[model samples]
Target: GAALTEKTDIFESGRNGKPNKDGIKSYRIPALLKTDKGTLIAGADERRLHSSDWGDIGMVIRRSEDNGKTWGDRVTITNLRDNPKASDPSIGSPVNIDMVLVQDPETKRIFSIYDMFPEGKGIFGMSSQKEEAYKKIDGKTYQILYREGEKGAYTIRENGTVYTPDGKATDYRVVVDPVKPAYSDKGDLYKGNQLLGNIYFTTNKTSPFRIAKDSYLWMSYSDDDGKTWSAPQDITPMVKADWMKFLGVGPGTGIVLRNGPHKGRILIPVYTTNNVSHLNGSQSSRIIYSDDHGKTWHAGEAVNDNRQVDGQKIHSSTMNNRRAQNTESTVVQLNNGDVKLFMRGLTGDLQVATSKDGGVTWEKDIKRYPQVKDVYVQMSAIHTMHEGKEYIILSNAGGPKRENGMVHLARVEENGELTWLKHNPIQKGEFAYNSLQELGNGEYGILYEHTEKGQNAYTLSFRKFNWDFLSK
Candidate 1:
C-alpha cells in the first residue's frame, strides 16, 4: 500500500562553503522524465556564485532507481571544459540553461535539449547514449563533439549530419543561430534608459519567423528516438504581441492535447512580452496547435487575453512586477476531458484557465486562492488521478509570508475548487524552481533544488507523493 508522506528535505546547504558548499549552490530549471529502465531522469542547472561579479554554471543529471526514495550521485553532463573561454572570469557564468527530456514514444530513446551562454549563439541537443555513439564513430579515442546547428536551432551532430528519407541518406543543413530577436527599443527598458515599448497595442501582425539577435523560442523533434533529431523551426509566427520591444518564449513545460474536441493535437502554450504597445512587458498566454503531429502549427487564440478584461478594475500589487498579466504558463489534460492551464499571475496569485475545446478557447481566467500570496512563483506541474473519485495534484511554492520555498500538493475538484491535501515542505529555507512527472504505478515524482543548512545553495532533489494519503 502506498502511504502519503510529508515532503522531506533531500539536499541541504552545508555549514562550510567551497567545494561542498559550491557543489550545492543555486539549482534551478528542473526537467523530469521517466526513463525506459524505470529510473527518473532529473536534470538542472547547477550554479556557483563566488562573488557578486563572478559565477560558474554547469548541467547536472541525477537518477532515482527506487522511485524517489533515494537519488544516486549527480553526474556532470556539461561543464566549463566544454567551453573554456566561456568559463573565464571576464566572461562570468556560462549558463547551460533549461534541460528538456523528450522521449520517443516508439523507440523509448531519450534526448536532452538546452542552451549554452557566452556562446549564446545556438541551442544544443545531446542523446543519452552520446558517449557510446562517440565510441562507434571512429576507432580512435572517444571525444565529445559539440555540433553547432542552424541559427536559433541547436545542432545534434556536426560532421556528416544526415537524415534518411525513403530509404535514402540525405545531408541536413546546419542551424546557425536559434536565439530570438530583441527589438533594440525594448533593450532600453531593462537599463532604465527609456520607457517601455508599446508593440502590444498595434494591429495584429505576424511575428518574426526566424531566430533573431535577441531571444526566441526554438524547438526540434526526434523521429528515430534521440539518436537523430530534426532541425529546429521557429514557431514565433503564431505569437501576438502585448508589448513592442521584447518577445521571448517561457522556459516551462507544455502538453500534447490528447482528449476533448481537438483530439490528437499538439498544444504548446507561449507568452510574449513587450513586443507590442498595449501589451508591453505585460503577458498574454497563447496556444499553438498542430493537428499534424507538429509538421505544421496554427496559432490558437490567447488563453488569457487582457483585452477582454481591460475594463475590470483591479488593484495593483508590486508583487506582479508591473507586467499587468501572467507568464510561464503550463498546461495538462485531465481524464475528464478537461485541460487546465496554470501560470504565474501579475496579481501575485497563481492564475488558472481551463479549455474544453482542446485549447482553442479558454474559460474565464481566475486566481486560485486569492488570499495566498504567490509573488515570484514559477509555473507548476499538475498530476490528476482517481484515488477514490478524482484529484488534481499541484506542485508550487506557497509564497508571501511562507517563503520557506516549499512544494504543495492540493486536490482540485471538477468545479474548479481547490482543497489543500498535502503541504510538503521539501527544501527548508531555500528558494528555486521545480518540475514534476507522474509514474506508471500511480505515484508522483518531482525534480527541484535544495540548499544545505548554512552551506552553499543548490543541489538537485527528488521526492515522491504517496497515494494512500489522498485516499483519506
Candidate 2:
C-alpha cells in the first residue's frame, strides 16, 4: 500500500469484512487510541475461523501516522497455536478477546489490557470449570457433563468421585483458582484434603490452577509511541477474584485521573461474571487502578453490590428464570474527581455507578439513567473539557440487535449524574460493538462495526465527528 494524499477520507484499516491475510474470518470488538504523539493505534479481536471467541483467535492492530487517513502494516500481538500443551512454558497462551488500550497521560505510553483463555473455554465453559463428568439435570438423573454448582455438579464415574472446595461431593466449589471461586460477604475450596497441601503466596496471588483455560488478564506496554510493543504479561493474579465466575479488561481504552485525591491514577474498566446459567452468562462492573502509573494494579469491589435501586437490584433478571447481566462497561473520571462507570445491562435501561474513593468501592446499589438506554450491547465513554465545559461522550449500537448506531453527548454535573444533553444518531443502519475517544481537536474518533445496510457486523468503519456535528 502506498501513502495517500489528504483527499483520502476513510480507508480500510484491517481486512475489509473478509478475513485478513491472517485468516481472521471477522473482526469484532474494535478499540482505538491516540498515542501521545497523536498517532492512532487501532486494536481488535481478529476472529480467525468463525466468529466464535474460540478456535484460533488473535490480537491485531493497525497504526496510522496521519490520523485515520492512511494505515501501516498489520501486527499480530498474540496468536496462540491451535494445539494446547504445545507451549513455551506453564499454561499455553489462550485466545485473546475483548481488549482495551490505556494511554498514560504523563509518560504518554500505551498499555494494552485483554482477556484470554484456552480453546473451548470462553466465558461460559471456563468460569464453571467444565468437564465431561456425568451429572443429573431437571431431576431426570441423566448422565452427562454440566456446570459446577447447577443441576448437580459431578457424577461418580465407575472409576472415582469429585468434591468442591467446601468438601461437598454433591456440589461444586471455587478454588484459586480466583475462578468463579465463589463470591464473598457478598461468599469454596473442595476440602477433603487434596494431593497438594497448603498454598503459600509470596506476592499475594490466590491458586491451585493459576491461569486456567478461563478468563485471564494480560498487560502489554508500548513506550516508544506504539511503533514497537512489549510481550503481554499475565496480570491475572493481581486483579483476579477467586469467587467471581469471569473477569476481563475493558474492550476500549482507559484514562488517567487528572484531579482529585487519587489524581494521576491509572484506571481501566473491568468486569466479572457469575450466576451464569449452564451456557448463558451474567456479569458485574469494577475498575483496577494504579497509583504508581501502571507499575501495579489493584481491583476494586464489584459495582453490582446487590443494593436496592428503588425496590429491586439492577443485577437480577426478575423474569422467566433467565440470568440478567450488567456486563461490558466503560469508565470516565468527572471534573469533580469522581469516577463514573456506565454499564451494559440487559434490562434495556442505562446502568451506572459512581465511585468517590477512586474505584475501590461504589454505591452498593447501581444507579440507572432512565433516559440514556440500549437493549444489550457494549459501549464506550470518556470525560474531558469541551470548550471549557466537561462533557461525557458515549457511543453504542441500537435499533434492535446491534443496529442503530447512536451517540449521546452529556454534560457531567457536580452531582455525578450524566444529563443526556444530546442523543445524536450516527447510523440508523446496522451497528455492533464500538469505541470512542476525544481527539486532539474538537472532533471525536470512533472505531466501530457498521454497514450501509443489512447485518454487516464484520465490516468495521472509522469515523470522526465534532461537538457541532452532534449538537446540530
Candidate 3:
C-alpha cells in the first residue's frame, strides 16, 4: 500500500449509444488534485448523453488515498437529472460543466469551481442580456426567477419561500437556499410538500420557480480533504462582470501561490467572452483569486493575446502563425515565486504568460511555444522539484487533431525563464484532455481522455511515471 502504483481505467464511457459500466453515457474534463493529506481527487463532467458539450452533465469525483494505486467509488457533487424522453435525444437538460480543482496549501482546504447551466441552456443558448440573476434582500442573496411572458418576477425569499415582486408569498418553496439549487445537499423544488422535481432536471414550466437560463459560476469547498463539502455558493456576482456574456473555468487543477509576498493566495484560471457564443466573441483568459482562504474571490486582468511579445511579432509553424486566441488555461508557480500561465490556443501552440502579483495581473509579454503541439484542447501543468531542480510538467494532446498524447518538461532558470528540457510521448493515438499531479519521490500521476482501439467513446485512464521516463 505504501509504494502505490498502477495503470487502469478509473472511468469510461460506453460506445455507440450505450451506457458505460458506470451507467453514464460519457465522462469528459479531467481535473485532478492531490490534497495535503495525500488524497488524490479526480473530478470530471459525467455526461449522460452522447459525448457532446450540452445535456445533463453532473460533476463527479473519485478519490484515492493510496496514491495512484487505487480509487474509491464515484462521488457526485451534483445529482444527475433523469433522462427526460428516451425517444428524443435532443431534449433540453441542465448541466454543471468544466470543473477546476485547487487546494489551499496553508489551510489544507480544497475547492471545486465549475460552470452551471440551467435547463435548455449552455454557452450557445446563453442569455444575451448581461443582467445579474441574483439579488440581495434582507442581507442575504437569493436567485431571481422570471415568470412566463413577463407575467412577473419572483424571488426565493427568506426560509425558502417564493415571494412575488410585490412581497406576496406564493405556495412555493425550494428544498433549501435557492442560491445553491444544484448543490448536493440543496437541490429540487417543492410546492409546500409536493415535489416538482429538481431545478436542474425540470423545465421552467414544470417547476416555473427556476432561475435564469444563463451561465453561472458556482463553488464548493472541502475542509475534510474532500470527504464532504459545503453546499456550493454562487460566486458569479463576486467575480463576473456585468458585460461578460459567458465565463467558464479552464477545466483542470488550479494553484495556490507558494512563494512571494502574496503566498497563500488561491488562483483559478477562467475565460470570459463578450459574445453569447464562444466562436463569435472576444474570448480572453483571466485568473480568479482568493486572498483570504476562499472567503472572498476577485477577477484579475485578462491575459492580452495580440500574437506579439514586446513589439516583436511571434510566429508558430502551424496555421501560418495567424491570430490564435488563448482560451482555457492552467497556472503554475516558478521557483522564484512568479506565477506562470500556460494556455490552450487555436494556433496549435500552447501560450505562456507570467504574473508577479500572485495572479492579480498578467504581463503583456505573452509567448507561444511552437514545440508543444496542441489541437486546441484543454491541457494541464504543475510545478515540482525533480532531483533538486525546479521543473514545470505539462500534459496535452500532441496532435494533428487531438492524437499523440505527450508530456513536456521545462526547467525553471534562476532568472524566472523556462528552458525546454524534454518533450516525451506518453500515448500513441487518439488522445484528448489530460491532467497531471506530482506523486512524490520523483513519481507522478496522470488522468487522461482516450478512446479504445476502434471504439468511439471516451475513456479516462490513469498511469504513474517518474523523472527518468521524462528525461529519456
What are the lDDT figures for the candidates, one per model? 0.48, 0.63, 0.76
> How do the residues 193-294 of candidate 2 rate in per-residue lDDT, one tens digit apiece?
432211111112222322223456877777887766666666776767545556787678888888888888888888776534422544666888788878
lDDT of 1 by residue, 336-410 (tens): 677777777667666777777787777765546653346755655666665466566556665654245555556
Writing each residue's lDDT as its tens digit, candidate 3 over 229-335 gives 66777798788776676788998999888778988889999987764334453566779999999989999877753335445543221112224456789999886
Better of 1 and 2 by lDDT: 2
Candidate scoring better on TM-score of 1 and 2: 2
RMSD of each: 13.1, 11.2, 4.4
Query: How far does residue 371 in candidate 1 sit from its true spot (Å)?
Result: 6.2
**TM-score leader:** 3
Displacement of residue 369 (Cα, Å) in model 3 is: 1.6
TM-score of 2: 0.74
Q: For model 2, where is the 10-residue window of minimal lDDT? A: 179-188
Q: What's the lDDT for residue 246 in model 1?
A: 28
